[PDB]
Design a protein around this nucleic acid. Structure first.
Ligand SMILES: [Zn+2]
Ligand SMILES: [Zn+2]
Lengths: 118, 59, 122, 37, 131, 204
RNA sequence: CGAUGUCGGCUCGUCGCAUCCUGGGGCUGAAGAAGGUCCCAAGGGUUGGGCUGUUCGCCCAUUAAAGCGGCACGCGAGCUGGGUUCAGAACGUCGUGAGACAGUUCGGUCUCUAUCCGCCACGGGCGCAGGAGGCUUGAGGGGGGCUCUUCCUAGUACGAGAGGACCGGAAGGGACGCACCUCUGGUUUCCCAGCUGUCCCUCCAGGGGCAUAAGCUGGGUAGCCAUGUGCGGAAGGGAUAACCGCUGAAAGCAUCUAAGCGGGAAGCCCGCCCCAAGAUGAGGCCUCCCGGCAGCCGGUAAGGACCCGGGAAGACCACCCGGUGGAUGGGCCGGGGGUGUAAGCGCCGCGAGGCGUUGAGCCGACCGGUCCCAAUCGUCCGAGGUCU
């Protein structure tokens, strides 16, 4: 019974879900747009929104917080420099999720791209 | 567990009967408002690459 | 929650030390014994030459439980032991004096003797 | 009510009556009160 | 509607306000009303608040004192009208919200792990000063 | 038989006479009447209540006509109180009063396809001593060749909960008219916000 | 005998009554209480443990009681394999021996996939003579049904006393069933903190991985939960069993019966809850809808569906909700809640560390707000009402 329990297991154990979120986020910031299965996307909305929110906060403590997950200096720099400004006046909704019409051939999985909002 | 096994051969009418619900619903399509092409709703038109009256993907 | 096979510290000076609950005298199929309950136990341990020696089957009463005890007010008490008083078959403490605190439910169950002897009723 | 199959008079006051289809040996003496069955 | 706001509305007529704030590790003497026989008398239960599950009006706390070499733990509804008054007899300096480990500690070590709270104590002396 | 619709907002204990009596809080009113089951017209006597109101763009034509036949606002949920002829046009908590015994019915928390232990409290099997893969199975289910079948209603797996449930003879701890809140001792079937219906108890 | 798996235990029951308790009653060598016996009665219950493979039995402590049996001495495509009964080994004994026991003793592989009927749940189709959307009723079916102690009655009746009532009320329990998470108590898989090793980021500091599919440890939200909370057994009505009667003839009397009428039980029916119109007998009420070729086709009405966004709804499906008019979910915000004073800095320390900043920082579900991001645009089905 998953009553009110939030979050998707995604058929990965805990640390694997977490590293998935980190790698997904890394590619997202590194590219803005990425293509991934739908549930990974919707389970990636919040995990990106939080990091970008700390981007909007921008202080050192946020630097080490987001750095706790991204684990990169350069990519975090781009985050606090290219993205923190461009989302400086947006409250939430830092990412957009669109479902693609064409499923993945290899398994019939449905695809959808997650993009940083403009 | 003593290896349960089908008792008798399934008659053809019964087989087809169980396969009755095996029909494949046709994938519902709506015309892309951009290029007038059919495609699944609530998705990006892979033809035009637009969505919500604006561009999303690079066709 | 006292059940059979449980060990109980005797809270009084009858001579025993611990008693193993082998029954709970509350109806036939009583699952658990608690404060103010009448259990029947064995003397698994007694001071030398006490009033009771080991192996005696004795009616006792639970006066403290490491399982807490709610109350109609909302408050609840929980000791850090399981204690009982070796009573006679007439609801009178066979021992002369009890040791350590006890619960107030005893007053609710006609154990004003044990309540009185209690150095600290709670 | 002595229930049995050989309901019979015991005393002269033992009086038989076929009540409700059954045979009852009704008597003033309570002990002689018999029901056939 | 706000189900939470309705809840706080209901409990709001019962929430007690005057009780002194305290954190775990501290020591308390609770003047707690009692209905013995038919009369009522307030007994003080003084121990360590080893736990405070904060659930608004349903928040309650745990006191722990050793009565005659016997660990006596007690749970009080934080807003119980039966609880007459609370007495912060000591600002122990806890370090976790829950202090169950003291169940297994000799009282020497119990004290040695619960030191006084210089900050909250000095705040106490700072307050408690009438006009 | 008076009764009002309501919604379960949550549980809580209060202090009534130095007793932390746990209660559940139920936003009952205000229930407007929408139609009255009269025996000459509907074969029996009852009423039909609306709770909560509904966005007018979310109501089909038929329902809308059903409201316009009354003078009632479009309402989300609509039910019937059997054998209850409210005089007013909107049943509220005023019909109830503290101390009054009631019976409450609501859908239990649907526990999906529940196993056999959780559904019927079967003992299952042991956890050691060699129990092979049957730790929570119901063991046997019947007899040998006679009757060589399984009786109707043999307790098996299935959806435990998610069904209508009526806990009865509860106490109306308190009424809150200005809020249309109701404080009923004991727990009520259903999740928080789950629709429920309160009625006079059939006990004595 | 081209296989019907054999004692026992477990799980799960169901049923008979030749009734162990609970209910009713008769008689008594029934003073009361307690009993005995029999009669009617199967609704419910019938405890836990020691010994033994055991069933059985004895015992232990209770209990109202600690029922007897059938169901392939129920139940191994549900479990175990203790016993019996494979192969090894040993003893007593028999046999020259090989070996034998019904005597003993230690050990000894129990086989993932359910086709059908059955059962437990959930659906699709069609039907329910117009189409939909709601509400219902309830044919009928299931669930449940229990029991004890104490108090008053009243130490009253009874009784030399001893002892000790009926009836009628009151309260409190045990087990069981349902529901729920306010409280207690669990979990609470990464929400918080700490710690060890290693390696890495980036040297310090600060962090990350790994140590489990949490490294360990200290907590713990919501949810799920019981050990926690509430509620239930009804009350009552009806016909009855045993049994007890009024009237009463046959049969001058009497007769509970033969005409009749009544009382009469944990019993049956209703009553309580639940399911329920496939109840094909397809029910009832409210509301909404209106042509080209018994029909046919048409777009279609109402409406629905598909499609999302979800949901204490859920295997799927279904059900519910929302769909720009939107707060449905993710964000964010605010509260809750948890962890427990972040980092950084300053100061104090040789340093480990400590102090202030600081109930700080972080913060899963919880409770509301905000349209920031998503439920875009949409498509398709779906009335022309059979006849007396
Ligand atoms: Zn296009
Ligand atoms: Zn006679």
């Amino acid at each position: 019974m998953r009553h009110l329990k939030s979050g998707r297991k995604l058929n990965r154990h805990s640390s694997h879900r977490l590293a998935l979120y980190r790698n997904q986020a890394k590619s997202l910031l590194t590219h803005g747009r990425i293509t991934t299965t739908v549930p990974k996307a919707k389970e990636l909305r919040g995990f990106v929104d939080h990091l970008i929110h700390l981007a909007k906060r921008g202080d050192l403590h946020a630097r080490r917080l987001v750095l706790r997950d991204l684990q990169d200096v350069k990519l975090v720099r781009k985050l606090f420099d290219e993205i923190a400004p461009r989302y400086r006046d947006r409250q939430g909704g830092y990412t957009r999720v669109l479902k693609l019409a064409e499923r993945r051939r290899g398994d019939g999985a449905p695809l959808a791209l997650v993009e940083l909002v403009e | 567990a003593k290896h349960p096994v089908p008792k008798k051969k399934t008659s053809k009418a019964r087989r087809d009967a169980r396969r009755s619900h095996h029909a494949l619903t046709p994938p519902t399509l709506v015309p892309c408002p951009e290029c007038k092409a059919m495609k699944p709703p609530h998705t990006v038109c892979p033809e035009c690459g637009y969505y919500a009256g604006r561009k999303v993907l690079e066709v | 929650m006292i059940q059979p096979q449980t060990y109980l510290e005797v809270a009084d000076n009858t001579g025993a030390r611990k008693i193993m609950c082998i029954r709970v005298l509350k109806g036939s199929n009583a699952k658990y014994a608690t404060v103010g309950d009448v259990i029947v136990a064995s003397v698994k341990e007694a001071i030398p030459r006490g009033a009771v020696k080991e192996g005696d089957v004795v009616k006792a009463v639970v006066v403290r439980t490491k399982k807490e005890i709610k109350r109609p007010d909302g408050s609840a008490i929980r000791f850090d032991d399981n204690a009982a008083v070796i009573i006679n078959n007439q609801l009178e403490p066979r021992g002369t004096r009890v040791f350590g605190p006890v619960a107030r439910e005893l007053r609710e169950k006609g154990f004003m003797k044990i309540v009185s002897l209690a150095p600290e009723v709670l | 009510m002595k229930v049995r199959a050989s309901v019979k008079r015991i005393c002269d006051k033992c009086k038989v009556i076929r009540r409700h289809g059954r045979v009852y040996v009704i008597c003033e003496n309570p002990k002689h009160k018999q029901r056939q069955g | 509607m706000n189900r939470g706001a309705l809840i706080k509305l209901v409990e709001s007529r019962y929430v007690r306000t005057d009780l002194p704030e305290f954190r775990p590790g501290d020591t308390v003497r609770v003047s707690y009303k009692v209905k013995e026989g038919n009369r009522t008398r307030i007994q003080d239960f003084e121990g360590i608040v080893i736990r405070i599950r904060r659930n608004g009006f349903n928040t309650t706390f745990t006191v722990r004192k050793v009565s005659y070499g016997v660990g006596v733990e007690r749970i009080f509804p934080l807003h119980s009208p039966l609880i007459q008054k609370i007495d912060i007899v000591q600002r122990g300096r806890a370090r976790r919200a829950k202090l169950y480990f003291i169940r297994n500690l000799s009282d020497r070590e119990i004290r040695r792990k619960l030191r006084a709270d210089r900050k909250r104590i000095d705040q106490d002396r700072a307050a408690e000063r009438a006009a | 038989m008076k009764g009002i619709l309501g919604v379960k907002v949550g549980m809580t204990r209060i202090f009534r006479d130095d007793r932390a009596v746990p209660v559940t809080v139920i936003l009952a009113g205000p229930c407007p009447v929408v139609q009255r089951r009269t025996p000459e017209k509907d074969g029996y006597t009852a009423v039909q209540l609306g709770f909560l109101p509904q966005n007018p763009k979310r109501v089909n034509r038929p329902l809308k006509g059903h409201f316009a036949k009354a003078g009632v606002e479009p309402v989300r949920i609509l039910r019937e109180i059997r054998d209850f002829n409210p005089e007013g046009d909107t049943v509220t908590v005023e019909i109830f009063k503290p101390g009054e015994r009631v019976d409450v019915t609501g859908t239990s928390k649907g526990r999906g396809f529940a196993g056999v232990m959780k559904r019927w409290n079967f003992a299952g099997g042991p956890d050691s001593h060699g129990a092979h893969k049957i730790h929570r199975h119901p063991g046997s289910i019947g007899n040998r060749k006679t009757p060589g079948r399984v009786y109707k209603g043999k307790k098996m797996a299935g959806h435990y909960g998610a069904e209508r449930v009526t806990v009865m003879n509860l106490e109306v701890v308190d009424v809150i008219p200005e809020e249309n809140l109701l404080l009923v001792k004991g727990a009520v079937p259903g999740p928080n916000g789950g629709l429920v219906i309160v009625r006079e108890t059939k006990k004595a």
